[PDB]
Structures are given as C-alpha cells and as structure tokens.
Amino acid sequence: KVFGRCELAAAMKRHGLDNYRGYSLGNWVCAAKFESNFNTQATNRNTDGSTDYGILQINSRWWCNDGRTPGSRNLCNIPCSALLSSDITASVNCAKKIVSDGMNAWVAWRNRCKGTDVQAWIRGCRL
C-alpha cells in the first residue's frame, strides 16, 4: 500500500504521533515521505546485511528481526515482516521506540525534514 500524504497523516495522528516525544505530526509524515515515499512495502537492502523495512524504512540491525541480519537487536521486539503491514501500526510503534531511545535516527528526516516547515506535510489534510 502506498499511502496518500493526508491518509498517512491521519493514520499517524490516529497512532498518536502528533507531538509524540515533541515531534509535530508533519515530522513523521515527512519522514515517511522521504524514507519510503509513503510505500508501506518499501524495502531497501544495505551492504551491511541489514534491510530497511516499510513506510519508515526501519532497519533490521537494530529495530526489528528479519532473521537474516547479523547483530540483530530487535529493539522494537518485532519481526521486520510486521513493518510491511498495510496498516502503519508496527512501523509507528517501532518509530516511537526509535525516537524515544530525536528523529535524527531517520537520516532521511534529519536531511529532508528537519529544518523545513514539516507541518506543511499535514496541510490540506482532514485531521
């Protein structure tokens, strides 16, 4: 599933991401935009053997276990496959963990969102 910006904004809001850890909703939508272009099925394999999964491109070395990544911490305590769900719940719950333990974790966020009017990402949306 490739989310629409607003649909994702609404879903993220529904998942309490708005101002989660002080990060306004647009941060998360923006992060998702640049991480996966809102594609819940996005996967990016890294040379380190880890893979970034889902709408928030959560890495399998630290956050989820995909069973093929060495040094798997699985801090989100989830199989990476959970991150490929069409609903964003697992990704959001993990993202909440990632941000709990700053959104810089998403190089994409720090680089394409941080420092911009991230709230622009939730404008026009029925929230």
Epitope: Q41, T43, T51, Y53, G54, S60, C64, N65, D66, G67, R68, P79, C80, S81, A82, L83, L84, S85, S86
Partner: nanobody
C-alpha cells in the same frame, strides 16, 4: 490483510497420510512465506514446512523432510502439506501461517504475520 483457512486435518493411523490445505485470501501478494507450524498439547510449536510463493522454494523441519512435502498452488493461493508416513510424533495442531517479506527463517514462527485456526492432526 490476509486470511488463512486450513482444512484436511483429522485422525489417521501411523503410516497413514493426510493432506492439509491452507487457503490464503486477501493481500496474497504480501506473502513471502506460507508455512505450516504444528504444536502438540502443552508442547512448543514447530515449523513443519514453508514455501515462498514467488520462487517456490520449500523448507522442511528435519523431522518431516523427506517424508512430508509442502506444495503451493499459487493459482489458488493455497499451500498444502502432504503428510505421508505419518507417525504418532506428528500428532499436533497444524497451523497455517503466512509471513510477509521481512522474515527469512521459514520454520521460525516469529516473523509470521498471519495465522490460520490450526487443524488437528492425530496419528494413532
């Protein structure tokens, strides 16, 4: 987004055979592995067999490999478990499960995201 419905279970005599079927419906394209997990009463579950729909590669628990065969019918999004030379040790609840991409240990239930109700298989 995926529903798994098993059927084909039942009680058979040692040496007998049963063919479990698991029909997947829904977002079948999101399935990377369709597997069978079994669990005896009060015992830990065990990955029995799994197959990746796209490439058809099958995986088997050593205890059933060369005995059981798993087959996938992508046309019907149904995975089957041909249980040949059944033994008492095969008695258990057999669960169909589907794992999306992101889980690469076929016989490890951890990354399976969808589960069937589990069909009982009893071997006497």
């Amino acid at each position: 987004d995926v529903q798994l419905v098993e059927s084909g279970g039942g009680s058979v005599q040692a040496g007998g055979s049963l063919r479990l079927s698991c029909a997947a419906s829904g977002y079948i394209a999101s399935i990377n592995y369709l597997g069978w997990f079994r669990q005896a009463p009060g015992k830990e579950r065990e990955g029995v067999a799994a197959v990746s729909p796209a490439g058809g590669t099958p995986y088997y628990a050593d205890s059933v490999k060369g005995r059981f065969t798993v087959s996938l019918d992508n046309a019907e999004n149904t995975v089957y478990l041909q249980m040949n030379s059944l033994k008492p040790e095969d008695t258990a609840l057999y669960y169909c499960a589907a794992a999306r991409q992101g889980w690469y240990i076929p016989l490890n239930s951890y990354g399976y995201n969808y589960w069937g109700q589990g069909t009982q298989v009893t071997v006497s």
